[PDB]
C-alpha cells in the first residue's frame, strides 16, 4: 500500500482478496457463537471456500472475483506466478538491468570489425561509477561525491571530463544487442569508440548476424562490469572471434551488398 506522487494510494489486489476472506472468516466465527441455523452457517462456509479459492487461484472455479465497477479479475497468487507476465518468465528467467542503454543505429564503415561507435553522452552514464573514480584519481574534482554533482547539470560539464572517460574505457568492451535475439549473435562484444552524436555506429559485416538495417533499428548497449565479465566478452563474445555460423559452420561475417558490388 504505497502513496504515489499525488498523495493518492495505490494497492495490490491481494489486499482485497484477503479482506474478503477475513470478513467472511470473522462473520463465520460470529455466526457460530450465536448459534445460527445450519442453512446460514452453510451459506457462510461455502462463501468462505470461494474466498479462499479466489485468493489462491482466482477464476479457476466459478466467477472471477472483481473489484466493484470494473470487469478486471483481481490478480490472485496463481496469476502472479504463472504466464508471460508471471514471476518466472518476467522477473526470474529475465530482468531489467543497470549499466544499459539504447539508441538508434547507424552504419560505421570506417570501424574495424571489433569496434563500434558509442555516443559520448551514453558512455558517460553507462560508465558513471568508473568515471567518478577516475575524476578523483587525476583531480577533476576533490572527491567522488563532488564529481557526481558536476555531471548533474549539463553546463557544469567541462572538457577534461571527456578525456577522463576515454581513459576509463581503455581496452574494455561493451555488448550490443538487437532484438529479436534469435541466436547467440544477437549479442556481440565491441570495443567502443566514443563519438559525438546521438547514434550507435554498427560495423557493416555484423549487420547480417543481427539482421540489422538502417531503416531505424535501435540497439541496446550493456557494460560487463567485472574482470570476469569483461574477459568473457573480449574472448568469447567479441565480434571478430565469431566469424562462422554455429549452425551451419559457414562464414557469418562475410561480404554483402556494396562490398560484394564493388569487388
Amino acid at each position: 500500500m504505497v502513496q504515489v506522487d499525488g498523495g493518492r494510494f495505490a494497492t495490490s489486489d491481494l489486499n482485497d482478496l484477503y479482506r474478503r476472506l477475513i470478513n467472511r472468516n470473522n462473520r463465520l466465527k460470529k455466526l457460530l457463537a450465536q448459534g445460527a441455523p445450519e442453512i446460514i452457517i452453510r451459506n457462510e462456509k461455502r462463501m468462505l471456500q470461494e474466498a479462499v479459492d479466489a485468493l489462491l487461484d482466482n477464476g479457476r472455479r466459478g466467477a472471477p472475483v472483481t473489484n466493484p465497477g470494473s470487469d478486471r479479475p483481481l490478480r490472485s497468487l496463481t496469476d502472479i506466478l504463472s504466464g508471460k507476465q508471471g514471476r518466472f518468465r518476467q522477473n526470474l528467467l529475465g530482468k531489467r538491468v543497470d549499466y544499459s542503454g539504447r539508441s538508434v543505429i547507424v552504419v560505421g564503415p570506417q570501424l574495424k570489425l571489433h569496434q563500434c561507435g558509442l555516443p559520448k553522452r551514453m558512455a558517460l552514464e553507462l560508465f558513471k561509477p568508473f568515471l567518478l573514480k577516475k575524476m578523483e584519481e587525476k583531480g577533476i574534482a576533490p572527491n567522488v561525491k563532488a564529481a557526481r554533482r558536476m555531471l548533474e547539470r549539463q553546463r557544469d560539464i567541462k572538457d577534461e571530463v571527456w578525456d577522463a572517460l576515454e581513459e576509463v574505457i581503455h581496452g574494455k568492451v561493451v555488448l550490443l544487442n538487437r532484438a529479436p535475439t534469435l541466436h547467440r549473435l544477437g549479442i556481440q562484444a565491441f570495443q567502443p569508440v566514443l563519438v559525438e552524436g546521438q547514434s550507435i555506429q554498427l560495423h557493416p559485416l555484423v549487420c547480417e548476424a543481427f539482421n540489422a538495417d538502417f531503416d531505424g533499428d535501435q540497439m541496446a548497449v550493456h557494460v560487463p562490469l567485472s574482470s570476469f565479465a569483461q574477459a568473457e566478452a573480449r574472448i568469447q563474445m567479441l565480434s571478430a572471434h565469431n566469424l562462422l555460423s554455429p549452425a551451419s559452420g559457414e562464414p557469418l561475417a562475410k561480404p554483402s551488398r556494396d562490398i560484394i558490388l564493388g569487388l
Partner: peptide, 8 residues
C-alpha cells in the same frame, strides 16, 4: 454451480 441460485 451458481452460489446465489443454490442459496435461493
Amino acid at each position: 454451480s451458481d452460489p446465489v441460485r443454490q442459496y435461493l
